Design an enzyme around this catalytic site. Structure first.
Site, PDB file in Angstrom:
ATOM      1  N   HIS A 166       0.813  -1.208   0.000  1.00 59.70           N
ATOM      2  CA  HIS A 166       0.000   0.000   0.000  1.00 59.70           C
ATOM      3  C   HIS A 166       0.852   1.266   0.000  1.00 59.70           C
ATOM      4  O   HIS A 166       0.329   2.376  -0.079  1.00 59.70           O
ATOM      5  CB  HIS A 166      -1.013   0.003   1.161  1.00 59.70           C
ATOM      6  CG  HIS A 166      -0.441   0.370   2.495  1.00 59.70           C
ATOM      7  ND1 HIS A 166      -0.024  -0.570   3.414  1.00 59.70           N
ATOM      8  CD2 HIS A 166      -0.273   1.576   3.089  1.00 59.70           C
ATOM      9  CE1 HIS A 166       0.373   0.040   4.516  1.00 59.70           C
ATOM     10  NE2 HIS A 166       0.232   1.342   4.346  1.00 59.70           N
ATOM     11  N   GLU A 201      19.576   6.870   7.922  1.00 62.65           N
ATOM     12  CA  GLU A 201      18.908   8.023   8.513  1.00 62.65           C
ATOM     13  C   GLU A 201      18.569   7.900   9.989  1.00 62.65           C
ATOM     14  O   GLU A 201      18.359   6.802  10.510  1.00 62.65           O
ATOM     15  CB  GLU A 201      17.596   8.295   7.768  1.00 62.65           C
ATOM     16  CG  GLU A 201      17.765   8.884   6.388  1.00 62.65           C
ATOM     17  CD  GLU A 201      17.859  10.391   6.428  1.00 62.65           C
ATOM     18  OE1 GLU A 201      18.305  10.928   7.465  1.00 62.65           O
ATOM     19  OE2 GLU A 201      17.493  11.030   5.423  1.00 62.65           O
ATOM     20  N   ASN A 239      17.684  11.520  11.818  1.00 62.09           N
ATOM     21  CA  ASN A 239      16.865  12.729  11.761  1.00 62.09           C
ATOM     22  C   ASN A 239      16.615  12.929  10.267  1.00 62.09           C
ATOM     23  O   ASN A 239      17.535  13.274   9.523  1.00 62.09           O
ATOM     24  CB  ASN A 239      17.627  13.929  12.335  1.00 62.09           C
ATOM     25  CG  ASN A 239      16.773  15.181  12.403  1.00 62.09           C
ATOM     26  OD1 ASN A 239      16.069  15.517  11.451  1.00 62.09           O
ATOM     27  ND2 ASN A 239      16.841  15.886  13.528  1.00 62.09           N
ATOM     28  N   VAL A 252      17.472  16.650   8.789  1.00 64.37           N
ATOM     29  CA  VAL A 252      18.823  17.200   8.806  1.00 64.37           C
ATOM     30  C   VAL A 252      19.883  16.258   8.252  1.00 64.37           C
ATOM     31  O   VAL A 252      19.861  15.059   8.529  1.00 64.37           O
ATOM     32  CB  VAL A 252      19.231  17.578  10.249  1.00 64.37           C
ATOM     33  CG1 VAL A 252      20.657  18.107  10.274  1.00 64.37           C
ATOM     34  CG2 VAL A 252      18.262  18.609  10.806  1.00 64.37           C
ATOM     35  N   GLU A 257      23.101  14.442   8.335  1.00 63.69           N
ATOM     36  CA  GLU A 257      23.979  14.035   9.419  1.00 63.69           C
ATOM     37  C   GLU A 257      25.321  13.502   8.929  1.00 63.69           C
ATOM     38  O   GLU A 257      26.275  13.406   9.701  1.00 63.69           O
ATOM     39  CB  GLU A 257      23.254  12.992  10.274  1.00 63.69           C
ATOM     40  CG  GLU A 257      21.960  13.539  10.866  1.00 63.69           C
ATOM     41  CD  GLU A 257      20.912  12.471  11.106  1.00 63.69           C
ATOM     42  OE1 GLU A 257      20.456  11.843  10.120  1.00 63.69           O
ATOM     43  OE2 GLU A 257      20.543  12.266  12.281  1.00 63.69           O
ATOM     44  N   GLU A 301      23.909   9.408   5.593  1.00 64.85           N
ATOM     45  CA  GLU A 301      22.835   9.048   4.679  1.00 64.85           C
ATOM     46  C   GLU A 301      23.292   8.585   3.309  1.00 64.85           C
ATOM     47  O   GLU A 301      24.369   8.946   2.829  1.00 64.85           O
ATOM     48  CB  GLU A 301      21.874  10.224   4.483  1.00 64.85           C
ATOM     49  CG  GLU A 301      21.256  10.743   5.760  1.00 64.85           C
ATOM     50  CD  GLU A 301      21.999  11.934   6.335  1.00 64.85           C
ATOM     51  OE1 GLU A 301      23.210  12.093   6.057  1.00 64.85           O
ATOM     52  OE2 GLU A 301      21.366  12.707   7.080  1.00 64.85           O
ATOM     53  N   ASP A 326      -0.231  -7.664   1.794  1.00 69.77           N
ATOM     54  CA  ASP A 326       0.330  -6.322   1.756  1.00 69.77           C
ATOM     55  C   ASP A 326       1.853  -6.333   1.915  1.00 69.77           C
ATOM     56  O   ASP A 326       2.383  -6.043   2.988  1.00 69.77           O
ATOM     57  CB  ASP A 326      -0.324  -5.470   2.854  1.00 69.77           C
ATOM     58  CG  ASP A 326       0.040  -3.998   2.764  1.00 69.77           C
ATOM     59  OD1 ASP A 326       0.504  -3.555   1.695  1.00 69.77           O
ATOM     60  OD2 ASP A 326      -0.156  -3.277   3.767  1.00 69.77           O
ATOM     61  N   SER A 351       3.990   2.766   8.238  1.00 72.50           N
ATOM     62  CA  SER A 351       3.614   1.783   7.224  1.00 72.50           C
ATOM     63  C   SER A 351       4.798   1.325   6.381  1.00 72.50           C
ATOM     64  O   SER A 351       5.614   2.144   5.950  1.00 72.50           O
ATOM     65  CB  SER A 351       2.551   2.376   6.289  1.00 72.50           C
ATOM     66  OG  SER A 351       1.400   2.788   7.005  1.00 72.50           O
ATOM     67  N   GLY A 352       4.873   0.017   6.152  1.00 72.99           N
ATOM     68  CA  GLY A 352       5.943  -0.554   5.353  1.00 72.99           C
ATOM     69  C   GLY A 352       7.190  -0.848   6.160  1.00 72.99           C
ATOM     70  O   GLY A 352       8.090  -1.549   5.692  1.00 72.99           O
TER      71      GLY A 352
HETATM   72 CA   LIG Z   1      19.352  12.867   8.109  1.00 76.25          CA
END
Ligand SMILES: [Ca+2]
Length: 224
Positions: free
Chosen positions: A40, A52, A54, A57, A59, A62, A84, A177-178
């Site tokens: 979905h 990740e 935050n 922002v 960091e 990422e 699903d 979700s997911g």
């Molecule tokens: Ca971040």
């Protein structure tokens, strides 16, 4: 996540954020180039954000990678949310390190009473909306199928299971979700649905990953 706590930075290396302009769903990295999420959460274009904590922002840990192929389960039912689950292939393999790594697939179905870890950047309130910048965590037990069916009469299929507290107060929510439900180091579920969030007698409903192990293996082998 409602009633949870802020996870320690990068303590859940397998947690990913699905971004389409903004965060809208979670996912789990199971291989360098493959992510598991909920059907979905499907969208034509999806950018997967790994490493990740935050989400607002930068960091420095990422990894932003666009999805090249999105595969929803063949028997996914948009109306009932049966089956699903969805697979996302990254355009390029993620760089595996201390802050970005994979989670294993289950070797057996979830057992009632098992404590699991649910995580996400979803809504933190039962009413209204408050989306957190930092990743939230929640420790919750798998409920019996009996309790699950009793909470959602005629809505629970063989691909679903419940995790949470019947008294309410702690639960996953919109935009979680997911995301992953990890128990004993294995990915047992995918955040799917529920009535409200953290409401009494309405625990979260999750997709039983164990039922799709063969489909995942075959689908990945045929698309890599
Ligand atoms: Ca971040």
């Amino acid at each position: 996540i409602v009633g949870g706590y802020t996870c320690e930075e990068n303590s859940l290396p397998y947690q990913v954020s699905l971004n389409s302009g903004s965060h809208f769903c979670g996912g789990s990295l199971i291989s360098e180039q493959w992510v598991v999420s909920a059907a979905h959460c499907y969208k034509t274009r999806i950018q997967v954000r790994l490493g990740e904590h935050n989400i607002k922002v930068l960091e420095g840990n990422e990894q932003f990678i666009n999805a090249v192929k999105i595969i929803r389960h063949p028997k996914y039912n948009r109306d009932t949310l049966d089956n699903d689950i969805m697979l996302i292939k990254l355009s390029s393999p993620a760089v595996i390190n201390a802050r970005v790594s994979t989670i294993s697939l289950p070797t057996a179905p979830p057992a009632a009473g098992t404590e699991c870890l649910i995580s996400g950047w979803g809504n933190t309130l039962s009413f209204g909306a408050d989306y957190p910048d930092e990743l939230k965590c929640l420790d919750a037990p798998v409920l019996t199928q009996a309790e699950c069916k009793a909470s959602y009469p005629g809505k629970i299929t063989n691909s679903m299971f419940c995790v949470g507290f019947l008294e309410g107060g702690k639960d996953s929510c919109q935009r979680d979700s997911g995301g992953p439900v990890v128990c004993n180091g294995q990915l047992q579920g995918v955040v799917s649905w529920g009535h409200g969030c953290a409401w009494k007698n309405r625990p979260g409903v999750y997709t039983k990953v164990y039922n799709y192990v063969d489909w995942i293996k075959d689908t990945i082998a045929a698309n890599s």
